[PDB]
Amino acid sequence: KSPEELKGIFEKYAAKEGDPNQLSKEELKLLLQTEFPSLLKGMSTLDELFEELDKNGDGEVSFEEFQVLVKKISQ
């Protein structure tokens, strides 16, 4: 609900896989599951998100690349 929670929430998940600033498909999935399951139904599918967010040569999301979604979530 709040930004503080969401923030920590992301980490609480990012902590699981990779650094606290690193996200994972399987991870985000869950998040997008509880966090915002509607964002999943959106035109941006999991893969779409994972791929969209993951804008590098490694294969992994991060708070930064993720914030792009948050902004779209809030804005």
PDB file of C-alpha atoms in Angstrom:
ATOM      1  CA  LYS A   1       0.000   0.000   0.000  1.00  0.00           C
ATOM      2  CA  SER A   2       2.554   2.522   1.200  1.00  0.00           C
ATOM      3  CA  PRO A   3       5.843   3.320  -0.551  1.00  0.00           C
ATOM      4  CA  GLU A   4       7.925   2.275   2.431  1.00  0.00           C
ATOM      5  CA  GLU A   5       6.404  -1.191   2.452  1.00  0.00           C
ATOM      6  CA  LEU A   6       6.601  -1.595  -1.307  1.00  0.00           C
ATOM      7  CA  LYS A   7      10.216  -0.480  -1.200  1.00  0.00           C
ATOM      8  CA  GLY A   8      11.160  -2.965   1.494  1.00  0.00           C
ATOM      9  CA  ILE A   9       8.884  -5.483  -0.179  1.00  0.00           C
ATOM     10  CA  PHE A  10      10.923  -5.364  -3.365  1.00  0.00           C
ATOM     11  CA  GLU A  11      14.127  -5.900  -1.423  1.00  0.00           C
ATOM     12  CA  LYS A  12      12.606  -8.590   0.762  1.00  0.00           C
ATOM     13  CA  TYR A  13      12.250 -10.337  -2.576  1.00  0.00           C
ATOM     14  CA  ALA A  14      15.407  -9.108  -4.261  1.00  0.00           C
ATOM     15  CA  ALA A  15      17.260 -10.385  -1.218  1.00  0.00           C
ATOM     16  CA  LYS A  16      16.054 -13.882  -2.022  1.00  0.00           C
ATOM     17  CA  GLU A  17      17.600 -13.987  -5.474  1.00  0.00           C
ATOM     18  CA  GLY A  18      20.760 -12.029  -6.180  1.00  0.00           C
ATOM     19  CA  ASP A  19      21.661  -8.850  -4.334  1.00  0.00           C
ATOM     20  CA  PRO A  20      18.907  -6.732  -2.770  1.00  0.00           C
ATOM     21  CA  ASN A  21      19.019  -4.625  -5.913  1.00  0.00           C
ATOM     22  CA  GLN A  22      18.621  -7.636  -8.170  1.00  0.00           C
ATOM     23  CA  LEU A  23      15.330  -9.223  -9.157  1.00  0.00           C
ATOM     24  CA  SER A  24      14.455 -12.486 -10.865  1.00  0.00           C
ATOM     25  CA  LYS A  25      11.696 -13.664 -13.174  1.00  0.00           C
ATOM     26  CA  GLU A  26      10.525 -16.260 -10.680  1.00  0.00           C
ATOM     27  CA  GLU A  27      10.889 -13.586  -8.026  1.00  0.00           C
ATOM     28  CA  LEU A  28       9.156 -10.699  -9.755  1.00  0.00           C
ATOM     29  CA  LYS A  29       6.443 -13.163 -10.702  1.00  0.00           C
ATOM     30  CA  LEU A  30       5.563 -13.544  -7.040  1.00  0.00           C
ATOM     31  CA  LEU A  31       5.810  -9.815  -6.440  1.00  0.00           C
ATOM     32  CA  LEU A  32       3.707  -8.938  -9.462  1.00  0.00           C
ATOM     33  CA  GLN A  33       1.503 -11.675  -8.054  1.00  0.00           C
ATOM     34  CA  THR A  34       0.807 -10.078  -4.694  1.00  0.00           C
ATOM     35  CA  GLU A  35       2.177  -6.607  -5.328  1.00  0.00           C
ATOM     36  CA  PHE A  36       0.176  -6.065  -8.496  1.00  0.00           C
ATOM     37  CA  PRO A  37      -1.448  -9.057 -10.207  1.00  0.00           C
ATOM     38  CA  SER A  38      -3.237  -6.622 -12.487  1.00  0.00           C
ATOM     39  CA  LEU A  39       0.044  -5.424 -13.944  1.00  0.00           C
ATOM     40  CA  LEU A  40       0.485  -9.001 -15.100  1.00  0.00           C
ATOM     41  CA  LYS A  41      -2.763  -9.003 -17.041  1.00  0.00           C
ATOM     42  CA  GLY A  42      -1.577  -5.760 -18.591  1.00  0.00           C
ATOM     43  CA  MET A  43      -0.109  -5.713 -22.079  1.00  0.00           C
ATOM     44  CA  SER A  44       3.195  -6.335 -20.340  1.00  0.00           C
ATOM     45  CA  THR A  45       3.469 -10.049 -19.662  1.00  0.00           C
ATOM     46  CA  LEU A  46       5.978 -11.637 -17.313  1.00  0.00           C
ATOM     47  CA  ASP A  47       8.453 -12.350 -20.087  1.00  0.00           C
ATOM     48  CA  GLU A  48       7.709  -8.896 -21.441  1.00  0.00           C
ATOM     49  CA  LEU A  49       8.507  -7.397 -18.058  1.00  0.00           C
ATOM     50  CA  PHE A  50      11.543  -9.562 -17.409  1.00  0.00           C
ATOM     51  CA  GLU A  51      12.820  -8.816 -20.892  1.00  0.00           C
ATOM     52  CA  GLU A  52      11.696  -5.201 -20.880  1.00  0.00           C
ATOM     53  CA  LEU A  53      13.147  -4.550 -17.446  1.00  0.00           C
ATOM     54  CA  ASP A  54      16.238  -6.623 -18.134  1.00  0.00           C
ATOM     55  CA  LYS A  55      17.990  -4.189 -20.443  1.00  0.00           C
ATOM     56  CA  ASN A  56      21.466  -5.673 -20.239  1.00  0.00           C
ATOM     57  CA  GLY A  57      23.556  -8.662 -21.253  1.00  0.00           C
ATOM     58  CA  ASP A  58      23.174 -11.004 -18.303  1.00  0.00           C
ATOM     59  CA  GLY A  59      19.515 -11.700 -17.632  1.00  0.00           C
ATOM     60  CA  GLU A  60      18.312 -10.154 -14.394  1.00  0.00           C
ATOM     61  CA  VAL A  61      16.177  -7.298 -13.126  1.00  0.00           C
ATOM     62  CA  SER A  62      17.082  -4.651 -10.576  1.00  0.00           C
ATOM     63  CA  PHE A  63      15.492  -1.936  -8.471  1.00  0.00           C
ATOM     64  CA  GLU A  64      16.700   0.641 -10.967  1.00  0.00           C
ATOM     65  CA  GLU A  65      15.469  -1.112 -14.088  1.00  0.00           C
ATOM     66  CA  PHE A  66      12.470  -2.056 -11.981  1.00  0.00           C
ATOM     67  CA  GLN A  67      11.683   1.466 -10.840  1.00  0.00           C
ATOM     68  CA  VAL A  68      10.737   1.931 -14.476  1.00  0.00           C
ATOM     69  CA  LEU A  69       7.704  -0.213 -13.749  1.00  0.00           C
ATOM     70  CA  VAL A  70       7.019   1.394 -10.391  1.00  0.00           C
ATOM     71  CA  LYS A  71       6.926   4.810 -12.016  1.00  0.00           C
ATOM     72  CA  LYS A  72       4.447   3.405 -14.507  1.00  0.00           C
ATOM     73  CA  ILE A  73       2.603   1.877 -11.576  1.00  0.00           C
ATOM     74  CA  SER A  74       2.418   5.091  -9.586  1.00  0.00           C
ATOM     75  CA  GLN A  75       2.232   7.440 -12.548  1.00  0.00           C
TER      76      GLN A  75
END
